[PDB]
Amino acid sequence: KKTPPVYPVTVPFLGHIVQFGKNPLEFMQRCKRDLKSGVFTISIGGQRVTIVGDPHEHSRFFSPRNEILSPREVYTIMTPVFGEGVAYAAPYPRMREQLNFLAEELTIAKFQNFVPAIQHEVRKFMAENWKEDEGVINLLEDCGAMIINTACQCLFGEDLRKRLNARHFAQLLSKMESSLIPAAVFMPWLLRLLPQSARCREARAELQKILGEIIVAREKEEASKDNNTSDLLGGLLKAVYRDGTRMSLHEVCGMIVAAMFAGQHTSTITTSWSMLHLMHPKNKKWLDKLHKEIDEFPAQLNYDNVMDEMPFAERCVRESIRRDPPLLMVMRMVKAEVKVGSYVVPKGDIIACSPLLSHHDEEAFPNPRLWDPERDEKVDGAFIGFGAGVHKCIGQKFALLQVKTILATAFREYDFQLLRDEVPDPDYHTMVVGPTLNQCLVKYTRKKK
Numbered sequence: 001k002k003t004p005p006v007y008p009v010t011v012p013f014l015g016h017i018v019q020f021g022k023n024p025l026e027f028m029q030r031c032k033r034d035l036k037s038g039v040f041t042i043s044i045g046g047q048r049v050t051i052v053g054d055p056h057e058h059s060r061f062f063s064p065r066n067e068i069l070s071p072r073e074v075y076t077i078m079t080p081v082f083g084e085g086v087a088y089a090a091p092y093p094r095m096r097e098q099l100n101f102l103a104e105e106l107t108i109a110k111f112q113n114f115v116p117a118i119q120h121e122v123r124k125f126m127a128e129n130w131k132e133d134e135g136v137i138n139l140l141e142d143c144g145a146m147i148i149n150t151a152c153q154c155l156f157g158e159d160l161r162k163r164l165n166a167r168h169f170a171q172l173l174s175k176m177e178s179s180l181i182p183a184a185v186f187m188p189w190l191l192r193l194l195p196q197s198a199r200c201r202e203a204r205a206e207l208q209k210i211l212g213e214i215i216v217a218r219e220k221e222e223a224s225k226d227n228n229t230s231d232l233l234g235g236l237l238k239a240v241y242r243d244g245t246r247m248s249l250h251e252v253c254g255m256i257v258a259a260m261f262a263g264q265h266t267s268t269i270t271t272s273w274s275m276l277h278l279m280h281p282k283n284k285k286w287l288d289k290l291h292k293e294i295d296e297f298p299a300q301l302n303y304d305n306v307m308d309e310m311p312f313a314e315r316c317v318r319e320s321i322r323r324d325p326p327l328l329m330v331m332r333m334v335k336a337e338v339k340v341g342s343y344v345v346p347k348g349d350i351i352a353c354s355p356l357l358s359h360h361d362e363e364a365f366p367n368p369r370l371w372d373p374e375r376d377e378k379v380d381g382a383f384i385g386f387g388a389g390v391h392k393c394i395g396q397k398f399a400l401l402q403v404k405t406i407l408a409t410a411f412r413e414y415d416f417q418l419l420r421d422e423v424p425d426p427d428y429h430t431m432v433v434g435p436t437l438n439q440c441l442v443k444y445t446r447k448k449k
């Protein structure tokens with residue numbers, strides 16, 4: 001009934017906060033290499049943090065119920081973003097229902113309009129921003145704009161996109177977002193109630209009231225039948241809890257924020273990496289192979305084109321998430337003892353499973369730093385870029401749609417070149433990890449026939 005060994009702590013209260021904050025990949029690896037155990041504990045803020053660094057053992061982390069292993073305590077930090085009693089802040093039965101309602105809004109049934117809607121906004125953005133035959137842009141920054149744009153198009157009804165537009169909205173997000181401090185989960189007391197938080201306060205409330213407005217409007221056009229609007233907001237209003245109740249404005253607001261917040265960063269980063277590797281000259285063959293798959297498409301693309309007819313592109317995307325998972329760490333609060341291989345993990349520990357670590361296990365992913373889209377996880381379940389089990393990603397399919405879609409539209413109507421020797425080094429200093437902002441400059445060369 002014993003622990004994984006604990007890495008030596010040079011200074012107790014810090015634990016390993018420094019070498020962790022500086023390069024968590026190198027660090028966690030060494031812990032692994034020296035400890036010689038995939039599974040090991042580290043001290044951060046004097047907090048037992050046991051990382052599951054063995055691909056075989058993932059099922060352990062993901063399979064267990066929240067009651068046994070709970071996200072909530074860990075993920076409190078979102079609550080201001082999402083709201084009181086929204087998602088994790090909410091009781092698990094409810095949070096589940098909410099997540100489900102959302103998940104339904106993101107099934108492939110809804111996707112019918114999306115590919116065209118997304119392609120439109122990308123072509124808009126390009127023409128307004130890539131006006132010249134050549135030119136230089138920040139790829140991470142542009143992609144960010146393309147994502148929030150194409151998303152709103154995808155999940156926002158006309159009227160809502162009238163009162164509220166993508167660029168502004170992005171601004172609102174970042175405003176609520178700037179509020180976050182990552183340290184906080186492990187040490188939640190730092191969250192107990194913080195300067196811009198008010199902005200998240202105001203950022204959110206502003207949004208909320210806009211909607212509260214929007215709703216009143218759409219209620220009084222059912223009489224007409226004027227529009228049958230089934231955008232994300234639509235669905236959420238038509239949802240009913242089991243107990244027969246409905247979602248209060250706040251919960252609706254929370255769930256839309258959460259939806260948009262997640263995709264925005266995770267997706268824009270994914271897009272960016274993916275393009276980068278492809279652009280790079282070493283990756284010619286892959287770039288060429290990409291083409292062999294999208295050259296023979298009509299300019300206007302449909303659903304069949306993207307899911308069923310771009311297997312490979314999707315490989316590039318997944319490989320990109322494999323090499324540099326946007327979310328380094330997933331976590332639970334061990335609320336009861338759990339077996340993990342030959343070890344046990346004590347109620348009260350903090351238990352994590354790191355895509356970042358796992359994606360660089362050699363058994364599973366030899367030479368991980370190599371971006372090889374045609375590589376296949378050597379150990380089943382190794383890849384966890386979208387997590388697994390109960391709490392696996394719901395946005396996964398929609399995201400793949402957008403990134404895949406964006407890749408096709410951009411590359412089809414453009415070429416590209418990295419303004420550097422080598423693909424950008426990730427920047428581990430952000431809550432969600434993306435390539436380093438300053439190096440994401442590149443030259444766009446238009447194409448013509």
Ligand code: HEM
Nearest residue numbers: 259262263266267270330385386387391392393394395399
């Ligand atoms: C590259 C794109 C994405 C990546 C890499 C990604 C990654 C992940 C990962 C690793 C998890 C596991 C969370 C955990 O175990 O703590 C997860 C969960 C989740 N993701 Fe994503 N995600 C992506 C896109 C999206 C998008 C676009 C949305 C919403 C639009 C979304 C919504 C969620 C939600 C709601 C969960 C919680 C699942 C649950 O707790 O049941 N994701 N995602």
Ligand SMILES: O[C@@](Cn1cnnn1)(c1ccc(F)cc1F)C(F)(F)c1ccc(-c2ccc(OCC(F)(F)F)cc2)cn1
Nearest residue numbers: 024075078182258259261262263266327328329393431432
């Ligand atoms: O899991 C998220 C993020 N996500 C997942 N897919 N897309 N986005 C999430 C959860 C539910 C949602 F509805 C929307 C979300 F975006 C989340 F809850 F907010 C979430 C939880 C924890 C973290 C997170 C936790 C700890 C972190 O520590 C940084 C470190 F790894 F230590 F370097 C960094 C990030 C990020 N996002």
